[PDB]
Amino acid sequence: LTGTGVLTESNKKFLPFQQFGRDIADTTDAVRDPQTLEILDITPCSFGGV
Amino acid sequence: YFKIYSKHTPINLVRDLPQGFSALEPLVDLPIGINITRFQTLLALHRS
Numbered sequence: 476l477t478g479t480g481v482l483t484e485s486n487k488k489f490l491p492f493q494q495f496g497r498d499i500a501d502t503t504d505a506v507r508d509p510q511t512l513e514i515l516d517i518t519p520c521s522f523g524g525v
Numbered sequence: 526y527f528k529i530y531s532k533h534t535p536i537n538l539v540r541d542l543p544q545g546f547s548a549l550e551p552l553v554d555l556p557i558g559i560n561i562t563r564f565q566t567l568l569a570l571h572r573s
């Protein structure tokens with residue numbers, strides 16, 4: 476699963492089956508690391524109008 | 526693909542099913558690849 480975003484430590488309590496998480500709009504906002512089983516939020520990199 | 530979803534609930538009702546909501550978590554994803562049309566559950570006897 477490729478992407479680009481800021482990875483932050485997550486406050487979500489994923490259940491054991493659950494691997495990746497979807498937000499209000501059904502985009503992948505949280506992921507479980509395959510090596511250390513921790514949950515990380517994926518906020519997108521800042522977007523601005525110049 | 527044979528999917529087993531399971532849930533255990535502490536209940537105290539005597540006869541019928543309790544009325545409530547309980548979501549079943551996925552337990553086993555099983556790769557069998559066979560035809561299933563009929564099933565039968567297994568019970569245990571008590572001998573004295």
Ligand SMILES: *[C@@H]1O[C@H](CO)[C@@H](O)[C@H](O)[C@H]1NC(C)=O
Nearest residue numbers: 494507508509510511512513
């Ligand atoms: C290897 O990955 C498993 C989960 O996939 C994890 O429990 C274990 O701690 C990992 N070991 C190392 C040395 O990273």
